[PDB]
Amino acid sequence: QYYIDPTTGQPRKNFLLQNGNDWIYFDKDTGAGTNALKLQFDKGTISADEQYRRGNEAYSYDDKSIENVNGYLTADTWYRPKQILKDGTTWTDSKETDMRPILMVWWPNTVTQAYYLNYMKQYGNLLPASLPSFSTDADSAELNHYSELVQQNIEKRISETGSTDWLRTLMHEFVTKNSMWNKDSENVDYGGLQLQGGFLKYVNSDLTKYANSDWRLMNRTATNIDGKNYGGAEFLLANDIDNSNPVVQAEELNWLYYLMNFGTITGNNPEANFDGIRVDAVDNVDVDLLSIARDYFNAAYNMEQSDASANKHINILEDWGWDDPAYVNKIGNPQLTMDDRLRNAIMDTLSGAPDKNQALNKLITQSLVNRANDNTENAVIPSYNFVRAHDSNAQDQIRQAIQAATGKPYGEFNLDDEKKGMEAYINDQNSTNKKWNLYNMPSAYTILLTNKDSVPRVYYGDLYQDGGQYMEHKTRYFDTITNLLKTRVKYVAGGQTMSVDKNGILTNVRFGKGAMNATDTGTDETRTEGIGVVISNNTNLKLNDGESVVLHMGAAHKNQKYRAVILTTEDGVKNYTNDTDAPVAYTDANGDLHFTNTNLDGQQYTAVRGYANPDVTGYLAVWVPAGAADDQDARTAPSDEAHTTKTAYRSNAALDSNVIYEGFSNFIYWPTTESERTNVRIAQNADLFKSWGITTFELAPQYNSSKDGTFLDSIIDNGYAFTDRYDLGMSTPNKYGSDEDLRNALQALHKAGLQAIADWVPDQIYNLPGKEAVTVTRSDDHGTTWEVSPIKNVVYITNTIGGGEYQKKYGGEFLDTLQKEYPQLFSQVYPVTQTTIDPSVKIKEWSAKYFNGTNILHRGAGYVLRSNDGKYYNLGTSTQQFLPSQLSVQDNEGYGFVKEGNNYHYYDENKQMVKDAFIQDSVGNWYYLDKNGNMVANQSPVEISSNGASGTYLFLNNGTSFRSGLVKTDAGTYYYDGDGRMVRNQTVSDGAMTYVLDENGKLVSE
Ligand SMILES: [Ca+2]
């Protein structure tokens, strides 16, 4: 049973003993003896190589086991191996927290494997710094050695750090350096409205069925209702809402109702609702939305009944396309079109530099209205107009100034950078030669605010400096533009004429309330109303001797004293806010005012000539009748008379009596004190706005910013880039204040008699935190397939699930009230979808099925893992269960140690019989397959070369190579060393033992 040395009580372990014809083997652990001849190979034995491959297979197909999205794997997937290469040395059952990167054991091809090896060496220090780079010509047996070496090194570092945080960072840095896993494979392109460098459209697939849609009707704008034309671009920014899906349409109506009742709903406060909407991004959404909004306002407010009804809810469109006005008029002018022809006329003739401005005649004709002799009402398409807006000649130039002032890439800035750029911007604004600011602002606003048949919109950043706390600092134009605004209320009314003379000088007249043509004699109030404007854009203007400029003030204004409102001087302008001290001019018997190159009655600045200063490049003079009462008001109230046409607004004296104020800039700073909050300040200044004749205050969009930095909107947090549509400063303040500050602002505007506009932004939503696998195609801004992209019908990981708590709370929640109060809204058929909205499903959380697509996300065409034949790996959730072979169980039949006849063989990974080779099992035993592939197991010394000269080996009957032990035979005792080779002619130590072996290997002593 045990073999002890009676002179040392020491047991011999791992000892092979001949006793007559019997052989006894005394084992390694306790020296317990067994019949050596009956030792048997363990049928369940597996090789060290096999152990290695099995250790690395996935522990299971559990969602917990393998990081996935809708069952799909990504380059960033980590998983739970069956075993973990403990400290790079000991295979040990994984724990559920033992997540390992799939890229530690799998690569899409040998080049990426080579690149991984190079990267882990160079940036990971997971291989010797002095190892040569691996080239695409790297041998696989070679790649695989170093790959295992790297895994051994990852596991040693985890043993040392107790962590994989570092390995997450490192592996993702590697991932993002592979084109197939970054923007390089996404065909980045900024053409058209690819503002963020490209789009991916969502398409139906059996692979991502939960993201399918029956809708996604794209580009169905005013010019493309039937989808047979091109339309406006469906795709603009972020996650594009599918506004063609009738369920989404019902949700847009729900949201609209929320905005229009915001004060009642969120504060039980009937003075804190919005009164109108701005429809943002009109030409990037299904034009059904304009009809849905109209229909709601008709049901709730009876817009089409009369001007008095419609004008209580002034709505506007952000509709850039020049074919849109005709369509807006045809559907009943439910929201006012802009007049982009007219704004461009101003841009082309006043706002450019002296060497750019064109002939002023364009102001007369390039518009929805021809203003040569505008002597009628209710006869043109009603519209609003503006010189600037938060994103029209503001945000681009302000970024140009920031870039120039700081040197940073366009569009990249911190707040310090913003302030520096603003300083440069305002300095430029105050210069005669402007790089980033429009020219002739006084003349431009004079045109804006004296035109007939227009609702003018004043821009915050022309009154106050664009960047700064709200209303922190005035522009150089504040006095000028507010003078114009107050003068508009007091004097501007009646018919208009515009003409440009032989000298290129524009004469613009309004006759005053009660007079439509120059020949009208007017009513009682006409005499001291009206206005006359002289504008040139010619900085070198010089009238010859005897030449003149004549304003035809008209038959109501014969032999009348006029006084100046604005005159141009060498260095700027002079404003006169009333009659006191204002230079005077008299009309003749015909109502004509005459000006020349000579001053009137010794009054400086009453001659006409060209100037060039920070205000005026050309000439500006504006004149009104002297002797108006201080309270004169030339506006017209809207009539209650029933409309005889299907329209909300009508272009007439009452509509013209309105002025919109776009009361924000993108570059308002976040407040440092509660008192700096925009909406607190708006509440404090309602009477001021009223004094300028503002009748509706356009607030910024109030949605809390997503703050994700993916577009200017979510860099300066203006409210156009948001995750939660219903969160208006509610979860936390927006840039303008809390929801209570917003409601107090609405209540204050109302107290002063002003309306308030909600910016309705149905086009998109940003920064949804939940990942979703979706089949997509790289496309342009119209959803047209990007022909050279390999991303066609490819599963891609999108960020499409979420929408915030207020979307959850309020989503679809007003649909019941709507159907009860206004059932007509639910039977209306819309022209694009050709069906009704669908309130049967409430949207409380967004997902891909409700989106047309997304901007490209820079994850790479190949981010979602697929085999070489194009089959997607999957846990089985969304498609066939399928994993990389490195992660799968294999059929071991005919592989590894296989008995055949009276012999054992070993078949390698190619199912090829191994010959003349040593193989180690998973528990450290060594076996030798002979030159015929037969395992040696005959317990007889045998000569084998493993590399050089032959060594003498001995294999027990179970096939194991006998090593580090004695063999005692009747003819002598021999010692086999740790390599399994007989030792001859030397003295050796084996732990506590020292053995002396003679030249035949016989033990001489121990
Ligand atoms: Ca869209």
PDB file of C-alpha atoms and ligand atoms in Angstrom, residues 219 233-237 239-243 281 283-286 762-764 781 852, ligand 1:
ATOM      1  CA  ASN A 219     -40.738  64.931 -47.619  1.00  0.00           C
ATOM      2  CA  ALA A 233     -36.103  67.651 -46.745  1.00  0.00           C
ATOM      3  CA  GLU A 234     -37.647  65.273 -44.254  1.00  0.00           C
ATOM      4  CA  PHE A 235     -34.401  64.942 -42.304  1.00  0.00           C
ATOM      5  CA  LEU A 236     -32.905  67.896 -40.436  1.00  0.00           C
ATOM      6  CA  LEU A 237     -31.565  67.036 -36.924  1.00  0.00           C
ATOM      7  CA  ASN A 239     -34.180  61.750 -34.182  1.00  0.00           C
ATOM      8  CA  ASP A 240     -36.680  62.611 -36.910  1.00  0.00           C
ATOM      9  CA  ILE A 241     -40.258  62.150 -35.766  1.00  0.00           C
ATOM     10  CA  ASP A 242     -42.497  60.305 -38.243  1.00  0.00           C
ATOM     11  CA  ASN A 243     -45.251  62.936 -38.441  1.00  0.00           C
ATOM     12  CA  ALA A 281     -39.261  73.552 -39.359  1.00  0.00           C
ATOM     13  CA  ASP A 283     -40.609  72.334 -44.644  1.00  0.00           C
ATOM     14  CA  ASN A 284     -39.140  69.271 -42.807  1.00  0.00           C
ATOM     15  CA  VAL A 285     -42.388  67.745 -41.676  1.00  0.00           C
ATOM     16  CA  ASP A 286     -45.576  66.209 -43.063  1.00  0.00           C
ATOM     17  CA  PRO A 762     -42.705  68.557 -33.919  1.00  0.00           C
ATOM     18  CA  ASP A 763     -39.721  67.771 -36.179  1.00  0.00           C
ATOM     19  CA  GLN A 764     -37.368  65.929 -33.794  1.00  0.00           C
ATOM     20  CA  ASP A 781     -31.788  64.612 -46.289  1.00  0.00           C
ATOM     21  CA  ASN A 852     -38.145  58.218 -39.791  1.00  0.00           C
TER      22      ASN A 852
HETATM   23 CA    CA B   1     -38.762  65.551 -40.329  1.00  0.00          CA
END
